[PDB]
Amino acid sequence: VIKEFMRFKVRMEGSVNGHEFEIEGEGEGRPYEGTQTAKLKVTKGGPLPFAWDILSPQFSKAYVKHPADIPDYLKLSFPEGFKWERVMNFEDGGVVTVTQDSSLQDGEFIYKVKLRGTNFPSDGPVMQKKTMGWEASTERMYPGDGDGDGEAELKGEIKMRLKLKDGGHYDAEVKTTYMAKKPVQLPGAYKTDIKLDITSHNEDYTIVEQYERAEGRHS
Ligand SMILES: [Ca+2]
């Protein structure tokens, strides 16, 4: 059901330091090649009073290129799909939590994202929009119980680095649990290299285009 070219649709509802917003978007890519693009539109609460960059990694792990010796747990979860839950802890105290549901309907992926950002300094780079994109990342993937029910799924850990407009970097420690909606064979531990680029945007970031490339590899 996962073809060499696949489209997706995404909707995010969230709040950051109490500012509520909604975003709708669409994307496409080549799931076995590790490449994908997305176009997002702020449909409620725009223009956003905070950095787009804390949202961009929440908009698609079915599009990770896996070698044949790493079981592709998230591709194998379809057509039913999978869920993921994420916490990002930023170096100045900010917190982002995310829940996500991924399904396959009428030949396209459907992504539903809920996000809450809290504990951000009012004068920090996120609330003042002083960031300018993520450095490339390596996510460490391993089997483990991430939702506390005693049963293993797939976990990921990342140290992410956000570029600052004034120079230097703003770090986040990220933990994600990925849960197939049906029993799927789990891989052993491995690593995924990821780069997410903002490829275009309008003046107030109410329309944004993104490109991501991702590939798994042995440790
Ligand atoms: Ca579990």
Q: Answer yes or no: is 79 within a domain.
A: yes
Q: Which domain holds residue 43?
A: 6-217
Domain assignment present for 97: yes
Query: How many domains does the structure of the chain reveal?
Result: 1
CA distance 216 to 101: 22
Question: How far does residue 157's CA lie from ligand 1's centre (Å)?
Answer: 16
**Tokens at 41, concatenated:** 């539109």
Q: Cis before residue 71, ω within 30 degrees of 0?
A: no
Asked if 171 and 161 count as a contact pair (C-beta separation under 8 A), the reply is yes
**99: CA distance to ligand 1 center in Å?**
15
Give distance in angstroms: CA of 113 to centre of ligand 1.
20
d(CA 41, CA 36): 17
Residue 213 tokens, joined = 């490339």
User: Hey, what's the torsion of the CAs at 90, 26, 66, 54, to 10 degrees?
Assistant: -10
Query: At 109, which amino acid appears?
Result: F
Amino acid, res. 6: M
The token pair at 102 is 């991924």
User: Is residue 63 a part of any domain in this protein?
Assistant: yes
- Token pair recorded at residue 169: 């970097």
Pairing verdict, β 108-118 and 6-16: parallel
Please provide residue 73's backbone torsions phi and psi, each rounded to the nearest 5 degrees.
-50, -45
The residues facing 180 across adjacent strands are 82
Tokens 């609330």 found at: 127
Strand ranges inside 79-189, DSSP E: 82-90, 95-105, 108-118, 131-134, 137-144, 153-164, 169-180
> How is residue 114 written in tokens?
């809920």
Nearest to 217 by CA among 76, 65, 84: 65
Task: Judge whether 93 lies within some domain.
Answer: yes
Distance 188 CA to ligand 1 centre (A): 16
The alpha carbon of 186 and the centre of ligand 1 are apart by a number of angstroms equal to 12
The DSSP element (H or E) to which 4 belongs, if any, is none
SS3 of the chain: helix, strand, coil, percent, to 5 = 5, 55, 35
What distance in Å separates the CA atoms of residue 178 and residue 191, rounded to the nearest whole number? 15
CB-based contact 55:115 (threshold 8 Å): yes
Which of 123, 142, 147, 132 minimizes the C-alpha distance to 71?
A: 142
The alpha carbon of 169 and the centre of ligand 1 are apart by a number of angstroms equal to 34
In whole angstroms, give the CA distance from residue 142 to residue 139.
10
CA nearest neighbour of 204 among 57, 19, 59, 46: 46
Cβ-contact 180, 73 below 8 angstroms: yes
CA distance 215 to 219: 12
Residue 1 lies in a domain: no
CATH no. for residue 197?
A: 2.40.155.10
Neighbours of ion ligand 1 (CB under 5 A): 145, 147, 149, 151
143: left (phi over 0), alpha (psi -120 to 50) or beta: beta
Q: Write the DSSP symbol of residue 65.
A: B
Question: In angstroms, how far is the first alpha carbon of the chain from the final one?
Answer: 29
| Both tokens assigned to 5 | 């070219």
Residue 48 neighbours by CB under 8 Å, 6+ apart: 16, 19, 21, 42, 205, 206
- DSSP, collapsed to helix, strand or coil, labels residue 75 as helix
39 neighbors 26 (Cβ within 8 angstroms): yes
- Using alpha carbons, select from 208, 100, 119, 99 the residue that is nearest to residue 172: 119
Q: What whole-number distance in Å separates Cα of residue 216 and Cα of residue 118? A: 31
Is 47 part of any domain?
Answer: yes
Which stretch of DSSP H or E encloses residue 76? Answer: helix 73-76
